[PDB]
Design a protein around this ligand. Structure first.
Ligand SMILES: *[C@@H]1O[C@H](CO)[C@@H](O[C@@H]2O[C@H](CO)[C@@H](O[C@@H]3O[C@H](CO)[C@@H](O[C@H]4O[C@H](CO)[C@@H](O)[C@H](O)[C@@H]4O)[C@H](O)[C@@H]3O)[C@H](O)[C@H]2NC(C)=O)[C@H](O)[C@H]1NC(C)=O
Ligand code: HEM
Ligand SMILES: *[C@@H]1O[C@H](CO)[C@@H](O[C@@H]2O[C@H](CO)[C@@H](O[C@H]3O[C@H](CO)[C@@H](O)[C@H](O)[C@@H]3O)[C@H](O)[C@H]2NC(C)=O)[C@H](O)[C@H]1NC(C)=O
Ligand SMILES: *[C@@H]1O[C@H](CO)[C@@H](O[C@@H]2O[C@H](CO)[C@@H](O)[C@H](O)[C@H]2NC(C)=O)[C@H](O)[C@H]1NC(C)=O
Ligand SMILES: *[C@@H]1O[C@H](CO)[C@@H](O[C@@H]2O[C@H](CO)[C@@H](O)[C@H](O)[C@H]2NC(C)=O)[C@H](O)[C@H]1NC(C)=O
Ligand SMILES: [Ca+2]
Length: 583
């Protein structure tokens, strides 16, 4: 609404980052388009919508079928990443939720369409069902489809007619910890503790974790968290991002970062007793945002992109106001490579890092929107230790997405643990008008295979290639998500050539087009920056939990106790440079 022009703090909505073009990178604006949208009717209808209309002369294969033939597997053995901890997967979902969010279309609350899609699977308006192919076990037990609703679009929401359909991004594009503080002014206020001039975030008043805080409970019912265990009746958490409680390990990480804020706020009040509530809030919020960018750019990306890091994200050279900081519509699918790094089980470890109880290891599908396991079954220390001592799932061309997500995904709106995140992603690329695989290979200056043989050389897998061509008939029709994720991985990274390019650009753009990047001269002081350079996730753990043994590099596979050192050996964030002298 109004730019404070000389304020040292970002705005909640993301606006005013860029001075010439203020709304650039703000929340609730359209996702940027690196390539023109590709729709069946060229304006808004997705491919596969009208059964009869081909795409490049062929019918596009059912989402769920690509899922059955290509994406699934049975044997969970040998599937773990020998050199990436569970935190690797987990930090990616956080960076993701900070950068993008395409909410489904609403116009539903006392609607018979939410039921007309569920119940009868009739395609129409925003109901874009995922039909089950013949010979699918879910036909026998669930029905004929999986409800799916088209994502929201800008200008409107009601029917509409004008330009090409452009999806919304309900979050700020800048990597600014928006998932902790919120992207809307009204949500950001609700989240704060405006009862005490201490600038703290609100916490739970109904439950505590060893004197430590828990995220507040969401006031609104019906709550999906209460549904998964009608007896424990524990609601979902209230955070800066709506998906916070999507799965137990994500809500855990959310709790660690809320704790970090309040922790910084009370450490600041001590140094600068004179500062007011707004000042405390903003200054702590500014440090946390710097934390996300450091962990992400220093420790996280280098091991995702690998040898391709320098090629796409060169050394920083200053803020460049000509760079488009917005998240592209394709990034929101490229970053979903993370779905293939999610393992089937989640563990809880005790203080010696040994199983925690009878039921220490649990199926991933039992943890969706599961808040009672945290509150009523041990706190978050057992879960955090799991994130360090356990490994992520390694993407494997023969074993892409675990059945826990592939067949038992729980959707907050519906009542069953029977959705398919793989089919949903594929159905979502189409919903978003994504160009085919070769269109992106070309955008990244990569060869564009046209024959079966060609696809074998790119994928370096004869069988996978063969299945892809039987379903798609032409590499030009292959959906980006499954296309980019089937490529072999680059040296020392976790995604192939296409995915590296798409990720690389985005991250280099949101870092170079951010007026408030931490390394941006004038945003912090040389001394403040000297301090921040020491932030580490290991330390975040030491200061916000009761764990005392942690690894120096929490993202790699670490074995206990050999790789775990005592919290004393881990560098601290010296907040002294934030002391402000009067006269
Ligand atoms: C801030 O970010 C900006 C946005 O990306 C950057 O702007 C780029 O600025 C360059 C020029 O510095 C733009 O063009 C480049 O310059 C050459 C033309 O003068 C191009 O080379 C050749 O062009 C044709 C080939 O296409 C040849 O036939 C010809 O002989 C000439 O040699 C370069 O290849 C290059 O395009 C460029 O378009 C801008 N980037 C874009 C796409 O927006 C800028 O670098 C940044 N500013 C600073 C100072 O940091
Ligand atoms: C459950 C889910 C996860 C783990 C238990 C999980 C994990 C990740 C990781 C680890 C990612 C990156 C490293 C990542 C990226 C993005 N996802 Fe996924 N995710 C779970 C569940 C979902 C669901 C449900 C969606 C919505 C799918 C849809 O199309 O409707 C989802 C999405 C995305 C997403 C896009 C965001 C947007 O713009 O709205 C990523 C960038 N995830 N996830
Ligand atoms: C729904 O959530 C319930 C908790 O909110 C959960 O019940 C809990 O179940 C465990 C074991 O199943 C019990 O734990 C232990 O309790 C005593 C020790 O206090 C032991 O003697 C028992 O052997 C048991 O191991 C909890 O006491 C119990 N909580 C209560 C009060 O009911 C259910 O298991 C959850 N059900 C579903 C469907 O998820
Ligand atoms: C496990 O992963 C880590 C990180 O990917 C590897 O260690 C890094 O190796 C590079 C060499 O290119 C060093 O420059 C870094 O210093 C290492 N990271 C740190 C902080 O030590 C490690 O080699 C991997 N183990 C195996 C067997 O590949
Ligand atoms: C807002 O912050 C104040 C801290 O000043 C919280 O009040 C304290 O709450 C703790 C834990 O319930 C008690 O030990 C103290 O007695 C309270 N101190 C004072 C001076 O009030 C308050 O709970 C916070 N509110 C929310 C919603 O988080
Ligand atoms: Ca953000």
């Amino acid at each position: 609404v109004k730019c404070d022009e000389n304020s040292p703090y970002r705005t909640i909505t993301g606006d005013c980052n860029n001075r010439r073009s203020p709304a650039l990178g703000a929340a609730n604006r359209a996702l940027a388009r690196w390539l023109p949208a590709e729709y069946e009717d060229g304006l808004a209808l997705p491919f596969g919508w009208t059964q009869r209309k081909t795409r490049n002369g062929f019918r596009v294969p059912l989402a769920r079928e690509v899922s059955n033939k290509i994406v699934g597997y049975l044997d969970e053995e040998g599937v773990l990443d020998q050199n990436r901890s569970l935190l690797f997967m987990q930090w990616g979902q956080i960076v993701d939720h900070d950068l993008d969010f395409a909410p489904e279309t609403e116009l539903g609350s006392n609607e018979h369409s939410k039921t007309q899609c569920e119940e009868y699977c009739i395609q129409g308006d925003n109901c874009f069902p995922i039909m089950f192919p013949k010979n699918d076990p879910k036909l026998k037990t669930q029905g004929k489809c999986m409800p799916f609703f088209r994502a929201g679009f800008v200008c409107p929401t009601p029917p509409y007619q004008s330009l090409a359909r452009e999806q919304i991004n309900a979050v700020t594009s800048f990597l600014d910890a928006s998932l902790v503080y919120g992207s809307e002014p009204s949500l950001a206020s609700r989240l704060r503790n405006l009862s005490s001039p201490l600038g703290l975030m609100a916490v739970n008043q109904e439950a505590w974790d060893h004197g430590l805080a828990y995220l507040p409970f969401n006031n609104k019912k019906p709550s999906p968290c209460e549904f998964i265990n009608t007896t424990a009746r524990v609601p979902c958490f209230l955070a800066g991002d709506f998906r916070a409680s999507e799965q137990i390990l994500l809500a855990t990480a959310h709790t660690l970062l809320l704790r970090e804020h309040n922790r910084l706020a009370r450490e600041l009040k001590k140094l600068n007793p004179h500062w007011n509530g707004e000042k405390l809030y903003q200054e702590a919020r500014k440090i946390l945002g710097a934390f996300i960018q450091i962990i992400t750019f220093r420790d996280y990306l280098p091991i995702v992109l690998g040898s391709e890091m320098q090629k796409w994200i060169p050394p920083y050279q200053g803020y460049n106001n000509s760079v488009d900081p917005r998240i592209s519509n394709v990034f929101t699918f490229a970053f979903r490579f993370g779905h293939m790094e999610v393992p089937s089980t989640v563990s809880r470890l005790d203080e010696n890092y040994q199983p925690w109880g009878p039921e220490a290891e649990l199926p991933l599908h039992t943890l969706f929107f599961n808040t009672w396991r945290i509150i009523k079954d041990g706190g978050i220390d057992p879960l955090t230790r799991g994130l360090l001592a356990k490994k992520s799932k390694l993407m494997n061309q023969d074993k892409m997405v675990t059945s826990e997500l592939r067949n038992k995904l729980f959707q907050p709106t519906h009542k069953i643990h029977g959705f398919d995140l793989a089919a949903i992603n594929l159905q979502r690329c189409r919903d978003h008008g994504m160009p085919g695989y070769n269109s992106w290979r070309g955008f990244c200056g990569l060869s564009q295979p046209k024959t079966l043989k060609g696809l074998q050389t790119v994928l370096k897998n004869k069988i996978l290639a063969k299945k892809l061509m039987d379903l798609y008939k032409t590499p030009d029709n292959i959906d980006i998500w499954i296309g980019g994720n089937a490529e072999p991985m680059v040296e020392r990274g976790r995604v192939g050539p296409l995915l590296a390019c798409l990720l690389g650009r985005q991250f280099q753009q949101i870092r170079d087009g951010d007026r408030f990047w931490w390394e941006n001269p004038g945003v912090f002081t040389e001394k403040q920056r000297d301090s921040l350079q020491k932030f580490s996730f290991s330390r975040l753990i030491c200061d916000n939990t009761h764990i005392t043994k942690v690894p120096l590099h929490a993202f790699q596979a670490n074995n206990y106790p050999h790789d775990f050192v005592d919290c004393s050996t881990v560098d601290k964030l010296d907040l002294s440079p934030w002391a402000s002298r009067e006269n």
